[model samples]
Target: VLSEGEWQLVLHVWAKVEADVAGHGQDILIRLFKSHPETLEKFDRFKHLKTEAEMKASEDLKKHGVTVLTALGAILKKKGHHEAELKPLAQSHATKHKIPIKYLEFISEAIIHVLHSRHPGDFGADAQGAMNKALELFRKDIAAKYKELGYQG
Candidate 1:
């Protein structure tokens, strides 16, 4: 179970990640790689996301990364983005991961902690819905990718 605050934080963290990706794709990736070295093994798919060639070929990746960032920012910017859609997205991913909603909330809170410390701004109300959409899309993309790589689950 997730406390209301925890749930809110998860949404916020996801939102910030999505926003970063939207605004600066490669920059976020480079920043992430520098900050979380362990992620190279855990989130290896990210290693080739835009292709090192793409980044190397460009003047900067942060700008290029925006093109590849989370889909949440776009979804939230659309009309009819609402909590009704967000709740289901949250519940489904929690179930898929076989973790309690609270755990996901904690991960999100951790993300939020970093974002708040780094950016220090009000995301405004649109953040929540955008984040939920981003999380949902991420789950879908990962499941499909793993399946393509021969994952049964």
Candidate 2:
């Protein structure tokens, strides 16, 4: 999904972010939910989290966040298994949850927010663009499946 330089830049910054995927992943989730509390209703496992402190302490939330980031790493690294992984995910979001497509972009927004805040030097201007493109492409991949599943958006 990325050109050579973009792949290198995104992967370079991703390695730094990967140093603590679980930790950073949870934080990303936290930031995301906090930014869009309404989206919490979309998550059955985490919908009951009524407070920020409550959310940060939930192991299930932590697990989910880790899963999300790990899958992101898998996608960015072009793991052969990624298509299989995201297809089921797209099915759930499309057929089960009826989630808006923009919600995916919202998560992408949070990813950029968290990465830039956590690693300002590494996730600089060019890297930001690379990461954005990669994420957009990632969403496109899932959205393609959504299209196959008959989701309008």
Candidate 3:
């Protein structure tokens, strides 16, 4: 569970993120692909986006960014008290979408990087602990659901 202060900071960072959810999501995805180009191959739907320029204008990419960020907002609020909310996410990415569990950390790292850059004042070196802890828990909860679903990722 996130402490009051931890959750508050996370929510504080999220408030800005929510203001431009699509932009932030797209930014995070762009950063992720830039850092690990191979990650793009995991997204069958958007693998055709061979260039950052292509992704920049793709409505689908932006929509997907909003989708991811929306879920993240809910997960941060849940704060491990309701792991049940994680199951549908796990089921989709694991069984339906077939995303390997390794991508969990990859995405988390991308999020941390983006937030660090976007809000250095809020998620700066000393203030990122809440982010680290929260996303870590989010990943672990998804991993827990993976076990229950019998997916070998």
Candidate 4:
């Protein structure tokens, strides 16, 4: 339910970094771990990996980061029109990965932080608000699909 302006801002911001998914994805994961260290415990592969330097060097972390951003890029490419794309991702994480839905929910904040940091001069409160709202919409849709799949964690 983004306003026209919000939709435009989201697309604009996404377009700026869409081409560097690998790098941005890596940064997002690092930022997430830095901001919320507890999130690392969700990843059995990454739980033991302390320090951003350790994470940066881990192939497991890099792969998951690309996987996440690639999935996000799918929806962003559609300019918020293909939210259904997240359903399969959510279902897979819930049913197969056994990752809690709450952990997944933390991605938006990490992404927002990355976005702001990456484009400090261009990003401001208005843009941040729009991106936050956009990600929240994504979160809600993904969470709903996750719940419908009977995921409780």
Candidate 5:
């Protein structure tokens, strides 16, 4: 659980970049793909994108990136209370997509990298910790559905 100060920091850091949801989200996704090329296979729609620039400029990628960031924004607003809303998403990814927990684990780190890259001066250790914990909470909830359905992938 985040202290009030940590929560405030989380909100402040998120607010800094949430305004440019498209750019930031695109960057985060691009970074994820670059850092772990294997992840590209999961995005059947985007795996065909040949270059980093192509992927970043893709309407499909950008639209889905916006969707992801928006869902994450929702998670931040309610401070994990809206985590149950992730159930359907969790089920889809686990059952239909066969997305591994490893790929899911990279998301929080990817977001943290984006935050640090964009706002180096603003994100402190406390804020980082807060985001980590928050993402862990979100991840655990999603993983629960995967476990429930015996999804090993």
Candidate 6:
């Protein structure tokens, strides 16, 4: 079970992912949807996604896992400031896994959905505000995931 701090970290990470997705270019968003079509129903960015993968990679463990693990490995091998480390890891994942660079650029895009789905919050006026604050911290968490994975080029 997650302690309150751990749960909050998870929530922030989730928001960072959501914000990243929300901020993507329509073309890039479309590209992700093309690869993972089922996500279309859950997010407005689905309208941009247009591919023929047939399977919803968004919900598919294997595809998602490959992308995550590979990228994290790249992040781990990198050395420098934290954000600097994250860039290459994300870039490597984008290149090695055939995922769009934009998608990698915003790893925190789906975070909020995961939290909301599990917690079922009304959010009130706090949703956007909270998300903004969470995004900064969650960006670090995303970087940490790559570091823990021992990301490599």
**1-153, model 2: which lDDT tens digit per residue?**
578898898889889988888778888888888999878888888888888899889988888888888877887788223686788778988899887788889989999998999999888899999989888887888888888878955
* Of 2 and 4, the candidate ranking higher by TM-score: 2
Question: Which candidate order results from sorting by TM-score in descending order?
Answer: 3, 5, 2, 4, 1, 6
* Tens digit per residue, CA lDDT, model 4, 1-153: 888888778778887777777788889998878887877766777888877789888887888888888778778667667757876777777888776766756768889889898987657888899888878877777777877888754
Best by lDDT: 2
Query: For each candidate, what is the lDDT?
Result: 0.45, 0.84, 0.83, 0.79, 0.83, 0.42
Better of 4 and 6 by TM-score: 4
| Model 6: lowest-lDDT 10 consecutive positions | 72-81
| Cα deviation of 122, candidate 2, in Å | 0.7
Off by over 4 Å in 3: none
TM-score of every model versus the real structure: 0.35, 0.90, 0.92, 0.86, 0.91, 0.33
Model 3 has an lDDT value of 0.83
Q: For residue 131, give model 1's deviation from the true position in Å.
A: 4.0
In angstroms, what RMSD does candidate 1 have relative to the true structure?
Answer: 9.2
* Candidate 3 vs 4: which has more TM-score: 3
lDDT of 5 by residue, 9-59 (tens): 888889988889888889889988988889888888888887987986798
lDDT of 3 by residue, 4-61 (tens): 8888888788887887899899989988887777788888888898788998999999
lDDT of 6 by residue, 93-138 (tens): 4345433333443443543343344444533235534544444443
Q: Model 3, residue 96: displacement in angstroms?
A: 1.2
How accurate locally is residue 29 in candidate 6, as Cα lDDT from 0 to 100?
Answer: 37
Model 1: weakest 10-residue lDDT segment is 97-106
Model 6, CA-based lDDT: 0.42
RMSD of 6: 10.8
